[PDB]
Amino acid sequence: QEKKERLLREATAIKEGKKKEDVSKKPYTVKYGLNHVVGLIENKKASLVLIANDVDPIELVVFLPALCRKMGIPYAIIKGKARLGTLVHKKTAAVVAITEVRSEDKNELAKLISAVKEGYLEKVEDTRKRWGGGIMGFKAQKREEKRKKSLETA
Amino acid sequence: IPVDPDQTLKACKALLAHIKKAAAADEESTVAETPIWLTLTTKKHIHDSHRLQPGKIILPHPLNTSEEISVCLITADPQRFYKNAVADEFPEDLRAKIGRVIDISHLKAKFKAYEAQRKLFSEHDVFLADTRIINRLPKALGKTFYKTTTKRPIPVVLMAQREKRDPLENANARPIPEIVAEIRKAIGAALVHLSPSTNTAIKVGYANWEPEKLAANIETVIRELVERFVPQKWQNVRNFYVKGPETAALPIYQTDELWLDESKVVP
Amino acid sequence: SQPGVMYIARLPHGFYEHELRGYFSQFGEITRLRVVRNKKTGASRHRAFIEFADAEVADIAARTMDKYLLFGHILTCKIVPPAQVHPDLFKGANRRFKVVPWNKMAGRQLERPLSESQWQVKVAKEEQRRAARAEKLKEMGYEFEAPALKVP
Amino acid sequence: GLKADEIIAQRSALPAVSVRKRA
Amino acid sequence: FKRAEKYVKEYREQEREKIRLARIAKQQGAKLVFVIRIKGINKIPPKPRKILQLLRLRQINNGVFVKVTKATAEMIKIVEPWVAYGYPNLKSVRELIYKRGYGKVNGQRIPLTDNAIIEENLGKYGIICIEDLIHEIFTVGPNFKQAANFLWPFKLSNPNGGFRPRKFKHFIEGGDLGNREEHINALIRAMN
Amino acid sequence: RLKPEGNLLKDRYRSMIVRGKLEARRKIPFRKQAKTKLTEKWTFKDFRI
Amino acid sequence: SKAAKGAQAKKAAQAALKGVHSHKKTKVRKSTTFHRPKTLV
Amino acid sequence: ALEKKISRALGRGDVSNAARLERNANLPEKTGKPRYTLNHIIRERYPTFQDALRDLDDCLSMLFLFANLPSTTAVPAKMIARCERLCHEFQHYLIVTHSLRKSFLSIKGIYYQANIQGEDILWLVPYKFNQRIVGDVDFRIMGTFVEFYMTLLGFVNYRLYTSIGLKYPPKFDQVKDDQGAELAAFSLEGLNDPSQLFANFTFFLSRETPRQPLEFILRAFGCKRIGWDAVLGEGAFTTDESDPRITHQIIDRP
RNA sequence: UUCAACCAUCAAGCCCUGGGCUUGUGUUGGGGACCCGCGGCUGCUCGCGGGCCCUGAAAAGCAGUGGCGGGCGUGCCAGCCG
């Protein structure tokens, strides 16, 4: 509806003999779509990158933390591709990014970027290199505890 | 007035000569941009609380007449009407002097940060503010603008003189020549600031002017400041001094009684 | 056993003694608490020290609330070592820090009537103050005939 | 400039990678 | 568990309310109004909560009739953040008294199903029927205080409760501070 | 001073039941809730600090 | 107990970092047979 | 399905989409009409206008009872105001055609008997007091009866007004309604003997008198000039009690 | 278990016809040189208020003064005054 209203206003300006740039301002939106966000990261335009934690297949985003680290972009893994889709008016978004914001939100963006830097990346700087999984089952853990206790007693 | 003008003009010559001989130890640039401060000492606090809206005193020789001075004007919503008014129906000297016009809503949006307030403080020399919104400017500008009284927003009247007003539909503004007269009057007027203190310092001129101009300026600001902004008139007044930013204080008036009234005398 | 002291800074305006006590009482019971405030005006200096009776509970609170983004502030929560704990750290803790109108007091003594003896004392000290300013303004090239203070 | 602008525009030293020359 | 942001928000709300109350008290400075208790901030300062106790507005969606004097205007200005008030008209007064009108008899809530209760409790003052009560309330007579004390506070409904996706939403949102004048009648129609 | 008697809502309801447009039923103030078991979520179980 | 205060602090940390909706209702089943739910036809 | 879509929009935060889908829900709280249209049901249930007139007894009793009740989730306030509107329109038709025949002040209410097209219609109206809703009735199925009888009475009123050649619906003045006109808020305009007992009299109803039944009976039995106290509402012929044109006054005070 | 917005986007009072005056009190914290005014301090100095710069909404004891009421003389007041 907003795009339709903007197109009607731009058509009115064209009919009255004015460019669409005279009636429409420069937009500022979040950036979405995996190819688009990867291109922005490679061109070093994205200020902040948020990657959904549950993309299946995982190969679509498995390189994205390494790409962001090489490009020097602040990135963060967040819960919910549906939660990102609610932002981008879709059912699901795999990754979102901010390239630039308005002047009244530049401070908020910088504070969020710094908060991400000392609150996510510094905490996961070591844990991102470790192998996951390896958790044993409940019954197997109980059997192992009983065996270790028996070995310690005997 | 108890003060004598020959002493004042002699003091301006002495202080100016001190300023050049101290600067001699660019020379002209060091001499210029040097404010001249009139210091009032009283017996009690001049006002009960801090007043963040400065008072204006009209001067025969206006201040800030140099073309390098940038003026930031803060108006009520919207800023578009006043920006168009400045761009179209203002004289060229005022158009060159006014470097930024921003309304209260955009000020609260873009300048809530302390670093943003310091940047806006550094980007201008004189801030003018519409009286409809000058009460909300202490919160919108913080202690950056009000810790120091030098660049406090000077009250100007832009309201047309006689529900929620729609800014886009109506501006409720007085005519443009009246706005221009108000802006030039506020730019040329000297500023007084009331604090719970016995000392008030008011910029009256620069070193590069002439001692006759400083004497006339200091005489009129003394008489107006005492008759308007000093409670209990002259028997509250203790001392008057003239000083530079780094020079000593040259007295131009002492009193003979150090008490407000005879009721303070207790035997 | 050993009490634990945490240092919390980057405090937003409003996150003060009562809010700190109420928030961290959920983590554990607090022995002492003090927000560093300026005696000039009574305003906070955006930092505080909290002593819990349990260092392990303090460690949990510090790791939980370190780098917490609150009202545009990224909070700084650390545990100070017991060797680095100052013995006079919690002086004035667990009591309110009052605001005192020093300027209003000074105005009141300026408006207080006094007795004639210190009236001659004050006009006398004004006399050598004006005299000292006179040999200061001898190098000025300036001269003023000073009216003598008549004594009450 | 502003510290917020520096933090937003802060990147790494490795140069940008482009698929093609754009307009 | 309580959040630190909730703690800071509560401190800032109470600081703002303290500033507003001190400003009103320092500044200082007859019609009929209908006052409906709405949702405001969680913690209420002692003077506004005492005024609400006097006005019998402890429960949300309670409505009372107030005669505008200097004192009552001051108390209304005090408790503006927790009430919505305006000028009721004759249809609103008539519908409120006939449909949701209850009487205070010995401290119990007795509905006005007849003229006998009004004649027994207000007959010494000349009010012998429901329409006499309506006349006294609307014209603000000498016995307005006793008529309003006889009338129990009106329990208004929540129309949002008739629709499941917005069932938990309160009907009157905070933010429209100040007098609503004749626009309180739409609220009375929707909630009566 | 007339004292109205009876309830017209109950009168119309009884008229409907007697004429047979609906049957006489009683009010159910509480319905039997579905029997459930409360368990902690896996993320809250595996939270470690 | 020390375990009790540690559990209280850990619960406070869990509430601060993850929220308060820690529990989910689960239907009880008196039979081991799952039936296809009856839907609108 | 539409309610599920509205819940989805509210859960995703699309407030504009939620409002746009909600305006298709046609809620009784916003329209004053039943949620589901019963126009095809009315013709099926009443093949003839005679059958409609014969069920009008229960219809009028139901709607005149629910015209005086507080708002609930089953029957909202706009719906109650619509019921009042339909009752007032039917009363205006009876006043204009002089079809009201008998009235009775019983201990439970006021019985009215009218004669429309050869059918005698007797219905009961409560006295204007706080009606008590008890838990011994199924109020929600009573509300469904209210929806059905409202849909029936709308068509009955349209047919009667068109039969006597009047514009339906009549013009309604919201300002006079807010000032309390009740029956006097309606202005009946043309499309495109016990009728004259009170024709020569001027009546004044006091404050304690029941204005709605007194006005309805007098105006249906020929009175053209009725005044009353200002708190009884707008639309009076006169307001001052000292008006010398008044011939009769109704009082009930000792 | 909501970190939103919400002061006056002008009112009231004077002059009595000029468009001017008064009130409506609302400021993040630190750091560095350095010119001052006023109160104590024998004095140094310390307070109160100005002048010139620096800074992500930055921070690592140094807390200092007298009383009304309230709580149990008081390192207690989400209550005030000085």
Residue numbers in the entry:
A (entry chain LG): 106 to 259
B (entry chain CB): 16 to 40, 52 to 188, 204 to 308
C (entry chain CI): 184 to 335
D (entry chain Ce): 85 to 107
E (entry chain CM): 51 to 79, 87 to 249
F (entry chain Ce): 395 to 443
G (entry chain LX): 12 to 52
H (entry chain CJ): 86 to 277, 362 to 423
What does the original paper state about this entry?
(D) Close‐up of the immature H68/H69 area with superimposed transparent model of H68 and H69 of the pre‐5S rotation state (Arx1/Nog2 state).
